Ligand binder design. Structure first.
Ligand SMILES: CCCCCCCCCCCCCCCCCC(=O)OC[C@H](COP(=O)([O-])OCC(O)COP(=O)([O-])OC[C@@H](COC(=O)CCCCCCCCCCCCCCCCC)OC(=O)CCCCCCCCCCCCCCCCC)OC(=O)CCCCCCCCCCCCCCCCC
Ligand SMILES: CCCCCCCCCCCCCCCCCC(=O)OC[C@H](COP(=O)([O-])OCC[N+](C)(C)C)OC(=O)CCCCCCCCCCCCCCCCC
Ligand SMILES: CCCCCCCCCCCCCCCCCC(=O)OC[C@H](COP(=O)(O)OCCN)OC(=O)CCCCCCCCCCCCCCCCC
Ligand SMILES: CCCCCCCCCCCCCCCCCC(=O)OC[C@H](COP(=O)(O)OCCN)OC(=O)CCCCCCCCCCCCCCCCC
Ligand SMILES: CCCCCCCCCCCCCCCCCC(=O)OC[C@H](COP(=O)(O)OCCN)OC(=O)CCCCCCCCCCCCCCCCC
Ligand SMILES: CCCCCCCCCCCCCCCCCC(=O)OC[C@H](COP(=O)(O)OCCN)OC(=O)CCCCCCCCCCCCCCCCC
Ligand SMILES: CCCCCCCCCCCCCCCCCC(=O)OC[C@H](COP(=O)(O)OCCN)OC(=O)CCCCCCCCCCCCCCCCC
Ligand SMILES: CCCCCCCCCCCCCCCCCC(=O)OC[C@H](COP(=O)(O)OCCN)OC(=O)CCCCCCCCCCCCCCCCC
Ligand SMILES: CCCCCCCCCCCCO[C@@H]1O[C@H](CO)[C@@H](O[C@H]2O[C@H](CO)[C@@H](O)[C@H](O)[C@H]2O)[C@H](O)[C@H]1O
Ligand SMILES: CCCCCCCCCCCCO[C@@H]1O[C@H](CO)[C@@H](O[C@H]2O[C@H](CO)[C@@H](O)[C@H](O)[C@H]2O)[C@H](O)[C@H]1O
Ligand SMILES: CCCCCCCCCCCCO[C@@H]1O[C@H](CO)[C@@H](O[C@H]2O[C@H](CO)[C@@H](O)[C@H](O)[C@H]2O)[C@H](O)[C@H]1O
Ligand SMILES: CCCCCCCCCCCCO[C@@H]1O[C@H](CO)[C@@H](O[C@H]2O[C@H](CO)[C@@H](O)[C@H](O)[C@H]2O)[C@H](O)[C@H]1O
Ligand SMILES: N=C(N)NC(=N)NCCc1ccc(I)c(Cl)c1
Lengths: 174, 347, 113, 98, 83, 115, 97, 48, 140, 171
């Protein structure tokens, strides 16, 4: 059962996506996105990406906090909608959950499934690498190379972030 | 906007497009589109009114959606080929997503609804960039991925664009919306010939940009954005009505004007591949473009519409607008046909 | 041939366009028309005003046009060179036919009555 | 493919349908855009980590950087929409029909 | 110099925090070029063996490659021990 | 497995304390007791009404700056490279551009809250 | 690239990260390094039209390494046969399994 | 296990090349108790 | 569409007319559904019921045009004993155009549709006979 | 596509060096000095062949030299060595720096009873050369024959015949 940990997290990942894609109040949509960010961090961690997993969680936690502030200012109503309060929201929520439940039930029944495209269902562990014993984290080595190989990437991202500040100032100065 | 800020933002618009055009890596192509999208939004909002706010919002939502589909295609391509080189894609589902994403960015039908509205909602100067410079990056990507593009998909997009562009322009009185529907139609010719001869796609793109720039510059010179305000031009700058007439006839593809050259060469390349029905259908459908170009010439140059008394006060001042490159552009827009064999420079 | 080069070095084995090339004269005429349109839109005496400006219109059109024609001529030379080299490499795809005279070839006659 | 890819590709599709089926709040749809970026980050990260494509490990980081620029741009326009109309409803943005 | 010196004494009075920031950032940008120990940073980073040193096939003509790790030939770290 | 167990125990312990808190005490629920608090007088309007954010521009700038730290956090690892000439230049370039971006927003009055 | 300024100028802006078999930090190899190297060298210079048929064997091996689709199909069969035999009682695993 | 299966050829490669290919986890631990499979796949990540 | 199109062209003219009407009706119904989906999405119905009413009205109209065409063109081929003649598609095409005028209650749309549906259908048979390509494959 | 040729279980049989990592780490610096030759011959084999099945015999000699190396420690410096690797074993990180006194006792024992000198900092990370008879493999990747290149286009570049030849143009 623990061997399916990545699959179980990916099921919760989708459930969080159905949470905010059905579009209740953005307060609850933010909560759905935070759950998916956490389990998504859990998924990437189980493939050897501790830094990537933690970083995406860290980034989305800051992002959804700003979304929370903007929600209370610019996207609120007298009766914010939970999933059960609106027929359209509830229908999308249940439709997504049922589709997910069926894909999970069948892929775990046949150890395989065909939902448009063929997916094996033997447990995600089968594809893992077998032979490693280096004295370093390969993901850390690749990320650190941003500053020696990715000079060009540094320039365009650095410039884009600077222009971003300039641009938002222009856009929001009516 | 501070003049230095405006220049820096314009250079970032160009840098984003140039990044797309020099990149051998899909990630840098996607970065270039994002950088380009970032810098154009402030140009759309530069006048700060509810219509510009709506225009920019509709543009951001469409472009940001297309970028997600583009990045999805790149990641699928990575899974099925293990590399990022900008070239043919190695998965047909990745090819569909990238093609739909580029069609969205180009505003090709049936992804076209944003082009008439966004162009109408922004200034003429910003619309000029939107309908000319912004076509370069998506076109340059199509130019490289076309071997893996689904032939039925791209020709379906091209045909729908020519029909919807032609029909849509018939009902317009606003100049910016007329240019927007014209752009949709011309995009169809560009991508119709892409599977057969991508060189003819570039010629059509280059000639379209020249003619479109010429029209927007002449509209800017008189600060005209409606059919009726453009009908006063005869009672102010008669020379401008003649230049508008010549360009509009050229854009309609009439010989012996330049705008006939791309249609001529695209028909040639299509007939060489035993494509007879499609080029005939495209040429006949393009008569809708000529119809509403001709209406403009009627109300602008070939008749004299009623004017107003206050117009006499305009006679006493000269045109002060820069009108940069306009003398060259209008000549190239109209008098290039004798030099058609020059298209080999684009090979 | 050479990557992102306007005029590859192999193009110098071709003769340059003559400065009396009829296409270059037409390009120069376009520069002249651009000069006149420049005067007209600014309500200056069309023929006479700003002859230095008109000269630069003609000269700049001719200058750019000379290099475009040089590249145009080069690209058609490359097309011919590629096509003939391919014909040499695949003779069986381009067989030389046996030519028959009309005395031997039967053509149907369709009367116009 | 491995079964994880089924759920991540499903997540991207759910968010894509979420983005394409607007309700009223513009912020609800901006959330779907951030969700689309989250699924791409996870799907990209898994492929790169599994294949030991060492240099590609930085690619997901770069994706998040431009996800934030997109998010900041989306919120800036939401502020201006909110100021104009008093709500972030998307049905107020219909002036450009004519 | 007076205008800049008068400008310095002014920002010390008004914005000492920003004076320290620019002073600190300046030393970051400048001192690495003036330091004599900067070269050792690359040498130390280069001398750290994260990878196995795959041996070369003795073709019979590489006199500067050691046969044994304790042979004289090859790079040495005596410079590092005295650091 | 140790990490998952530790998390489960922490939140199980917190949940149990909340269960005790709700099922141990004697309740006496009535309307006035559970009404919203506003210093003894009834609230005017819903608490769900829009609450203007005067630091909205700093909040958006936080998103961009928050992402810069994700670019900078790998710096301890990048310092282990042999290519230190490039790494130091690029490392300083990123921080300087962040400082320039802060300076711009500062000088253009972007850090001042709306009045 | 549409304009190959990288080739003309001799500057490597992004082609260092295009393939998993290019130089990596500390010479860490990708899992499919050899397969990518074999396909890349087979198809080099001959163009995609020829490479799509003359390097099909190499590309198929590379694709199998990337996604392991055929390997899991094989392991699925063996695992399905084993679970069938066990319940029927026909098979007993060896002590070391 | 595959003795009775009609078309099976035991030990057959999925690769055309005869070069040695490093096995993936499913091949190496294909028929082993989950406890050792769990240790070999997630043991390092889950260790404290 | 590719499979439903092959079915039609894979069953010879005049042989198994009922099967032919199944294929053309299936094509017409699919076209009507596509038109309904875009119509309902871009011009929201006043109520859920009205959206269903508009869909069923377009899908039936489109299926009726497909049914009358595939039947009449097959009957003409059978009766005339000429399975290769474009004229059969002209008669079938015009009949479909007439039904469109019927479902619309407008002799003018009926007349115009008969002419252009009839000619378009006749052109389709000619292209099938002669191998005309609409989306021609790149070759040179 | 062909069956994978695996050695039989009776070709993989070698006597194993059944000691713990703390034991290996304590002796590693002297082990690297003493067993360099078979060890560097196995690693040249593995990197050249890219196949574990092509290097089994070389790998077996690595095991034998290792057992011989540890037998020498057992016969002479058993007690100073046990104290040393017991100290290393206590550390959670197996740190050398915590056991310099026990390391000194071990080092002077093997230096006296065996003339073993500990390699200096940097020695064991050198790239060395090794002599061997085994020939360099010809086609280690088992590469097929590469496709033939497209024929080269060469000759004198001449003006296009009658110009562009586009429709009516005479130039
Ligand atoms: C992989 C699987 C796919 C992944 C997704 C799995 C599902 C997970 C959830 C995904 C997110 C769903 C988001 C739903 C949403 O936000 O839309 C809200 C959208 C607008 O929200 P609203 O503002 O509250 O309006 C409520 C009323 O609809 C307002 O009604 P009204 O006042 O406008 O009254 C007239 C009404 C009348 O409706 C009709 O005319 C219906 C006619 C149908 C013909 C039969 O007009 C319409 O509703 C036209 C739109 C109907 C939808 C388009 C159908 C064509 O409402 C809906 O359309 C309800 C749909 C909810 C179920 C979604 C099912 C998703 C499946 C998509 C296709 C899967 C492709 C693969
Ligand atoms: C940081 C963690 C700290 C946690 C500290 C936990 C508290 C430790 C001290 C426990 C002392 C015993 C609790 C007595 C307080 C009860 C509240 C009270 O005063 O009510 C008066 C009431 C008086 O009721 P009454 O019948 O006389 O009248 C009340 C009704 N009217 C108003 C109409 C008159 O006492 C009781 O009803 C029951 C007393 C039971 C005493 C045994 C306690 C059992 C608790 C189990 C409850 C079942 C639910 C599970 C809850 C979780 C179990 C842990
Ligand atoms: C060379 C090979 C390639 C072949 C392609 C075709 C080449 C021609 C390309 C044309 C490009 C546009 C340049 C045309 C120059 C027009 C010159 C002109 O219009 O005369 C100037 C005059 C302006 O008037 P104004 O400045 O006020 O002077 C006092 C008189 N009122 O103008 C006026 O006063 C006119 C005002 C009344 C409007 C009359 C409109 C009808 C006449 C239109 C003639 C021009 C049509 C050009 C279209 C192409 C023709 C083939
Ligand atoms: C109505 C306009 C909108 C719809 C677009 C029109 C397209 C439909 C008309 C079909 C005309 C017939 C046709 O398309 O022929 C195709 C045919 C393909 O044959 P091909 O493969 O190239 O040659 C080898 C033959 N096995 O082509 C050929 O073989 C060569 C034929 C020469 C090119 C003919 C161009 C089509 C002419 C159709 C219109 C003719 C009537 C003009 C009406 C004027 C109205 C005033
Ligand atoms: C070959 C075609 C070349 C096309 C040349 C375009 C010339 C356009 C000049 C129009 C007249 C001068 C002008 O002002 O243009 C408008 C715009 C500047 O904006 P403006 O409103 O005038 O004032 C800004 C102050 N906030 O000016 C601009 O920002 C320039 C926008 C046009 C850039 C794209 C032009 C088309 C693509 C060029 C590459 C060719 C391929
Ligand atoms: C454009 C003039 C015709 C105006 C009517 C427009 C008709 C429709 C236009 C559509 C295109 C059709 C053009 C047909 C000509 C192109 C075919 C052709 O002739 O190609 C060759 C041509 C040179 O012709 P060639 O036979 O070599 O004669 C040499 C004489 N020394 O080389 C060329 O291709 C370029 C020739 C273009 C023809 C005009 C250029 C001739 C030189 C006149 C320039 C003006 C000089 C005076 C300047 C006055 C300044 C105040
Ligand atoms: C050997 C040369 C043969 C001519 C070849 C013509 C080929 C077409 C070239 C189009 C470009 C024309 C020049 C641009 C228009 C400038 C002239 C103008 O706009 O107004 C007329 C103007 C006189 O009016 P004004 O403004 O008061 O200036 C006083 C100057 N004395 O200026 C004048 O005094 C007269 C200037 C010439 C008038 C040009 C009229 C426009 C003709 C357009 C018709 C289309 C061309 C014919 C189509 C076949 C093309 C070969
Ligand atoms: C086959 C079908 C089988 C169905 C089996 C289920 C049948 C349900 C039987 C319903 C019994 C009615 C119970 C009513 C009730 O529980 O309410 C009373 C009580 C709250 O307390 P109260 O009585 O209001 O006054 C004292 C307050 N301190 O209790 C409460 O309401 C509090 C409940 C708290 C939530 C726990 C659930
Ligand atoms: C809040 C909503 C939460 C939603 C969470 C969704 C979870 C998704 C379902 C995951 C369940 C997977 O179920 C997993 O399947 C495999 C099937 O081999 C089982 O693994 C099995 O291996 C061998 C098979 O011979 C058996 O001897 C063993 O008894 C059994 O464990 C796991 O014991 C089981 O845990
Ligand atoms: C808005 C844009 C702002 C752009 C700001 C850019 C700031 C760049 C300031 C220069 C920083 C680097 O300065 C430079 O650092 C490297 C080390 O990294 C030094 O390099 C020196 O030490 C390294 C090892 O560390 C050796 O490999 C090298 O041979 C030696 O020259 C240089 O002697 C020094 O000149
Ligand atoms: C590379 C990292 C180290 C370098 C430090 C990078 C950050 C540099 C920030 C520079 C800020 C300069 O621009 C800043 O603009 C405002 C104008 O609104 C100035 O002036 C204003 O702010 C200050 C403090 O808020 C007030 O005392 C003053 O009354 C007001 O006029 C600031 O005194 C000045 O500091
Ligand atoms: C308002 C006017 C709008 C534009 C009208 C344009 C008319 C175009 C007419 C259709 C062109 C030909 O259309 C298409 O031709 C090809 C042959 O090449 C046929 O192709 C068919 O050939 C074989 C047998 O011949 C069939 O078994 C097979 O199902 C199919 O491939 C198609 O069945 C036909 O649909
Ligand atoms: N039709 C294509 N897609 N390719 C293409 N242009 N083929 C034609 C070949 C050609 C034509 C002109 C030149 I000048 C050169 Cl050098 C080569």
């Amino acid at each position: 059962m623990m061997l399916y940990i990545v699959f179980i997290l990916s099921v919760i990942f989708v459930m969080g996506f159905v949470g905010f894609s059905s579009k209740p109040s953005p307060i609850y949509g933010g909560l759905g996105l935070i759950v998916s960010g956490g389990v998504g961090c859990g998924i990437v961690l189980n493939f050897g990406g501790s830094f990537l997993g933690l970083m995406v969680f860290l980034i989305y936690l800051g992002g959804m906090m700003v979304v929370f502030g903007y929600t209370t200012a610019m996207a609120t109503e007298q009766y914010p909608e939970i999933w059960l309060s609106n027929k359209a929201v509830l229908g999308a929520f249940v439709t997504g959950l049922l589709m997910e439940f069926f894909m999970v039930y069948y892929v775990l029944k046949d150890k395989e499934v065909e939902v448009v495209f063929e997916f094996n269902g033997l447990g995600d562990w089968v594809i893992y690498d077998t032979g490693d014993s280096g004295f370093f984290s390969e993901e850390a080595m690749g990320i650190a190379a941003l500053y020696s190989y990715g000079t060009w990437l540094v320039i365009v991202t650095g410039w884009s972030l600077l222009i971003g500040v300039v641009v938002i100032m222009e856009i929001t100065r009516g | 906007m501070n003049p230095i800020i405006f220049i820096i933002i314009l250079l970032t618009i160009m840098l984003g497009t140039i990044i797309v055009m020099i990149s051998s890596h899909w990630l840098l192509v996607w970065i270039g589109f994002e950088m380009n999208m970032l810098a154009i939004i402030p140009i759309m909002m530069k006048n700060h009114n509810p219509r510009a706010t709506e225009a920019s919002t509709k543009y951001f939502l469409t472009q940001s959606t297309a970028s997600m589909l583009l990045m999805m295609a790149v990641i699928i391509n990575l899974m099925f080929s293990g590399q990022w080189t900008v070239m043919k894609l190695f998965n047909p589902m990745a090819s569909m997503l990238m093609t739909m994403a580029l069609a969205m960015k180009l505003g090709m039908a049936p992804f076209h609804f944003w082009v008439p509205e966004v162009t109408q909602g922004i200034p003429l100067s910003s619309g000029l960039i939107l309908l000319t410079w912004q076509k370069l990056a998506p076109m340059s990507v199509l130019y490289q991925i076309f071997p893996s593009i689904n032939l039925n998909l791209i020709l379906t997009l091209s045909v729908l664009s020519i029909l919807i562009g032609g029909w849509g322009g018939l009902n317009q009185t606003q100049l910016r919306k007329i240019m927007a529907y014209s752009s949709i139609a011309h995009m169809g010719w560009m991508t119709a010939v892409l599977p057969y001869n991508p060189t003819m796609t570039l010629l059509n793109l280059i000639i379209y940009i020249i003619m479109t720039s010429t029209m927007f510059t002449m509209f800017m010179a008189n600060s005209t954005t409606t059919t009726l305000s453009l009908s006063h031009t005869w009672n102010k700058t008669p020379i401008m009505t003649v230049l508008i007439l010549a360009t509009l006839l050229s854009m309609g593809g009439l010989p012996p004007l330049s705008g006939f050259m791309p249609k001529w060469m695209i028909i040639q390349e299509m007939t060489k591949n035993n494509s007879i029905i499609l080029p005939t259908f495209m040429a006949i459908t393009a008569l809708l473009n000529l119809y509403f170009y001709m209406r403009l010439t009627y109300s602008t140059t070939l008749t004299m519409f009623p004017s107003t008394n206050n117009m006499k006060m305009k006679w006493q001042f000269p045109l002060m607008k820069k009108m940069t490159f306009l003398p060259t552009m209008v000549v190239l827009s109209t008098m290039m046909l004798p030099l058609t064999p020059m298209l080999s420079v684009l090979e | 041939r050479a990557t992102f080069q306007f005029l590859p070095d192999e193009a110098r084995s071709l003769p340059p366009p003559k400065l009396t090339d009829p296409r270059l004269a037409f390009v120069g005429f376009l520069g002249y028309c651009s000069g006149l349109i420049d005067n007209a839109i600014r309500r200056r005496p069309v023929l006479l005003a700003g002859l230095h400006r008109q000269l630069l219109y003609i000269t700049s059109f001719v200058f750019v046009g000379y290099y475009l024609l040089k590249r145009q001529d080069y690209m058609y030379a490359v097309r011919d060179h590629d096509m003939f080299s391919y014909i040499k490499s695949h003779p069986e795809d381009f067989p030389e036919k046996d030519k028959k005279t009309y005395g031997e070839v039967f053509e149907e006659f369709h009367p116009v009555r | 493919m491995s079964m994880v890819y089924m759920n991540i590709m499903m997540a991207f599709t759910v968010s894509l349908v979420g983005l394409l089926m607007y309700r009223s709040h513009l912020m609800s749809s901006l959330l779907c855009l951030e969700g689309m970026m989250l699924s791409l980050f996870v799907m990209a990260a898994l492929t790169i980590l599994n294949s030991h494509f060492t240099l590609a490990s930085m690619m997901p980081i770069i994706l998040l950087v431009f996800a934030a620029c997109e998010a900041a741009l989306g919120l800036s326009l939401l502020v201006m929409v909110s100021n104009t109309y008093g709500t972030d409803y998307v049905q107020n943005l219909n002036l450009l029909q004519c | 110099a007076e205008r800049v010196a008068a400008f310095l004494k002014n920002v010390w009075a008004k914005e000492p925090v920003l004076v320290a920031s620019f002073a600190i950032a300046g030393l970051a940008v400048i001192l690495p070029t003036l330091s004599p120990y900067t070269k050792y940073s690359l040498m130390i980073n280069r001398a750290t063996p994260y990878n196995y040193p795959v041996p070369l096939r003795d073709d019979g003509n590489m006199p500067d490659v050691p046969s044994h790790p304790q042979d004289p030939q090859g790079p040495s770290l005596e410079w590092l021990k005295r650091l | 497995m140790n990490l998952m167990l530790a998390l489960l125990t922490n939140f199980t312990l917190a949940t149990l304390l909340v269960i005790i808190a709700f099922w141990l005490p004697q309740l006496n629920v009535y309307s006035e007791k559970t009404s919203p608090y506003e210093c003894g007088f009834d609230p005017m309007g819903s608490a769900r009404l829009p609450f203007s954010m005067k630091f909205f521009l700093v909040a958006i700038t936080f998103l961009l700056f928050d992402l810069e730290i994700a670019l900078l956090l790998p710096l301890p690892w990048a310092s282990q490279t042999a290519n230190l000439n490039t790494m130091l230049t690029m490392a300083l370039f990123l921080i300087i551009l962040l400082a320039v971006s802060l300076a711009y927003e500062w000088t253009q009055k972007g850090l001042e809250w709306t009045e | 690239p549409f304009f190959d300024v990288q080739k003309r100028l001799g500057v490597d802006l992004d082609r260092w990260m295009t393939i998993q078999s290019a130089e990596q930090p500390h010479k860490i190899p990708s899992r499919c390094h050899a397969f990518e190297k074999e396909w890349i060298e087979c198809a080099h210079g001959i163009g995609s039209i020829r490479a799509e048929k003359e390097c099909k064997i190499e590309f198929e091996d590379f694709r199998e390494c990337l996604l392991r689709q055929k390997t899991m199909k094989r392991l699925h069969a063996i695992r399905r046969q084993r679970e069938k035999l066990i319940k029927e009682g026909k098979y007993t695993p060896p002590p070391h399994h | 296990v595959m003795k009775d299966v009609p078309g099976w050829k035991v030990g057959e490669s999925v690769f055309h090349t005869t070069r040695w290919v490093t096995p993936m986890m499913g091949e190496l631990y294909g028929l082993r108790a989950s406890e050792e499979v769990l240790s070999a796949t997630y043991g390092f990540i889950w260790y404290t | 569409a590719k499979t439903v199109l092959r079915q039609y062209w894979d069953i010879p003219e005049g042989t198994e007319c009922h099967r032919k009407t199944y294929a053309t009706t299936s094509i017409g119904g699919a076209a009507g559904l596509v038109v309904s989906a875009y119509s309902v999405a871009l011009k929201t119905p006043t109520s859920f019921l009205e959206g269903v009413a508009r869909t069923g009205r377009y899908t039936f109209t489109a299926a009726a045009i497909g049914a009358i065409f595939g039947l009449t063109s097959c009957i003409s081929a059978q009766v005339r004993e000429k399975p290769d003649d474009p004229l059969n598609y002209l008669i079938g095409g015009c009949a479909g155009g007439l039904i469109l005028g019927a479902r619309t209650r407008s002799y003018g749309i009926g007349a115009a549709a008969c002419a252009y549906m009839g000619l378009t259908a006749a052109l389709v048979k000619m292209g099938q006979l002669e191998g005309w390509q609409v989306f021609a494959e790149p070759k040179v | 596509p062909g069956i994978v040729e695996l050695p039989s279980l009776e070709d993989l049989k070698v006597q194993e060096v059944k000691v713990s990592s703390s034991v290996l780490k304590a002796a590693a610096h002297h082990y690297g000095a003493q067993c360099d030759k078979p060890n560097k011959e196995f690693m040249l084999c593995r990197w050249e062949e890219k196949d574990p099945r092509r290097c089994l015999e070389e790998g077996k000699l690595v095991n034998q030299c290792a057992l011989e190396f540890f037998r020498q420690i057992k016969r002479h410096c058993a007690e100073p060595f046990t104290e040393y690797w017991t100290c290393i074993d206590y550390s959670g990180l197996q740190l050398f720096r915590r056991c310099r006194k026990q390391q000194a006792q071990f080092d002077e024992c093997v230096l006296d009873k065996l003339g073993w000198v500990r390699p200096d900092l940097g020695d064991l990370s050198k790239v060395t050369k090794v002599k061997t008879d085994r020939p360099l493999p010809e086609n280690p990747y088992h590469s097929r024959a590469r496709p033939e290149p497209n024929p080269e286009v060469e000759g004198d570049l001449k003006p296009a015949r009658h110009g562009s030849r586009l429709f009516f143009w005479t130039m």
